[PDB]
Amino acid sequence: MKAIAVKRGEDRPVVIEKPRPEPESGEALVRTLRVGVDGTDHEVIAGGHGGFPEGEDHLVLGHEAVGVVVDPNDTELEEGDIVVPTVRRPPASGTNEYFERDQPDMAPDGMYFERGIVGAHGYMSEFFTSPEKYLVRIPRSQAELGFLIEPISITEKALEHAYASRSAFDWDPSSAFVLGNGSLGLLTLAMLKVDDKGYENLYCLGRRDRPDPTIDIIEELDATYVDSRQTPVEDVPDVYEQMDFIYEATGFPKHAIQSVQALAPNGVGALLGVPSDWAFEVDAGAFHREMVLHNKALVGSVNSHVEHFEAATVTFTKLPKWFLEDLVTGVHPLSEFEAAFDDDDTTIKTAIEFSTV
């Protein structure tokens, strides 16, 4: 079968040929339909974040997949089920408490693999296998955009933990601010629009000049676009308002610290970005004091698990159809796969189509 991989010490993604996998007991064989590309694939291509599987000359890319079950083997899935795989798998050494208690999304560094990211091959191949417990059935009509279920689930987890931090009191937020206008930030902005907490005012931070299709999406969602070149995060409360909820999806360390100054009293910031080490001068006193005197919280979140994937299928149904059309800027057949990795300002979310139906 054909797969898209990065080979050791090489620049670009290439097609390689590999044997079709055979499922072991408890695994289904899945025929890949579409696989999404995000920053991590780019990040993994260049070098930073992730790592190749031991003893292998390459890494099959892709962690956002949808496929059709072609051989259910000895599992309780049915031939033709549309499934989305979770990303985390047990490490080489074997199972651990995080997997045994069904919360692999909470496993620390070195106690998990992430398919297509660290230690294990991804899903950009014509077929793959997985244990039934890590394959989530989704409605058949979500198959075409099913690679979006994984990123939606990332936000479903982050919101769950962020909201739990505010559960000891009566919190009624009215404003939310998403930092970043990438595919995660934009998806999140749309989710916040339909969130049960009933946000009235939405804001999204970016740094683009008009005309720009990400600005258009933000404003078409009835949110306010904030240019960070004109209004840094710290200054937002003066120009606009204090924000009850902040969701950080920029990967810019200054935002993690500065968001505390933009939070309303009793607010919470969710941090999703993954930056490199970067040292600079901060007023730690102001950070510390705001957190305490105004009962604020910061919560970090990574990955997601089955329950968040399931929740994502419901959220998906609530998202406007125009939004999904504008977010996915290209789906490319395997024959033209290189186009899926071209990044420019007009490219938002791409995917590669391996097969149909």
Added chain:
Amino acid sequence: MKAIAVKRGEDRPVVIEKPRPEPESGEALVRTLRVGVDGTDHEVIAGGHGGFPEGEDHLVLGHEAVGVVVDPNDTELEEGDIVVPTVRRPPASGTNEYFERDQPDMAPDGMYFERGIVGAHGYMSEFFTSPEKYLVRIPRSQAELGFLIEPISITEKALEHAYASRSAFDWDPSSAFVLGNGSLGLLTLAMLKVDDKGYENLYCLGRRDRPDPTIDIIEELDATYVDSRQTPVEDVPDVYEQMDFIYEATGFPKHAIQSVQALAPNGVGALLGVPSDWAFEVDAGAFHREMVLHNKALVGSVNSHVEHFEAATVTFTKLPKWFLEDLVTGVHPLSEFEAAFDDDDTTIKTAIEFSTV
């Protein structure tokens, strides 16, 4: 009646004479028994934190009080009830949502007074009044050390919010690290010893040379004393272990940032300290990345309300008697009140006794 106050633009606390207050409808008249002194009284004496009531030449100090109801007026309290007052009261402008929904502890700056701290006179007077809804009945046998109920309640709130942040997954902590060996840190260390989460290893940070009575308390509680001069917070995981729970009670901004590096995966830091502005170089990248990749949380907490005072009465009963004897280094009659404000390394918690029975 006699009161202990700081007069405008003066150095020291002094005795003033004031008329006995009369309770309005819904208020009881309370005869003060004992009032504790903490950092905030010292901080309020010198100048920083707090503010005098409008149009007044002085501030009656003290926010940690226990008293006996002498006139229940038209309330449902009974003559001779032992009560502890809460600290927050509505501001000059009048009530607001935080008070109406019974969560004044969540009110932002300018939407509350704090008796003995900002905008309203404290409890270091022979008598005071309060609304029945802000007077918490406690067991009669807790009257002698009843000024401890307020600081215990501070921790009851912080633990509630910190623990709520971890409620979306199965968290089973085994290690806890208290930063600071002041009266709040030491009380908190004792509370963690009897906490239902079942901590196995306890640690407390300070910077004292032996012999020192705070080191003795820490070690007598079977905790490990960590000298920050030898082992900074960031280095603790190498020398000892990663900490599931950190409670910050130093007021030192570096600790708010560095505690993220000492947290175990999935851990939470509670921040209680109130520092001044202070700017310095931090690796914000390392802070940001640890928070995200290891699903960590930081939660700030200030003040407390009725339910936390009630919980404190149960916690009090579980604290070892030796600990309470060693923590309270002096109770001073009104005649020798100045001694209650002397601070040195051998002084831990003091109180002033206004009356008995």
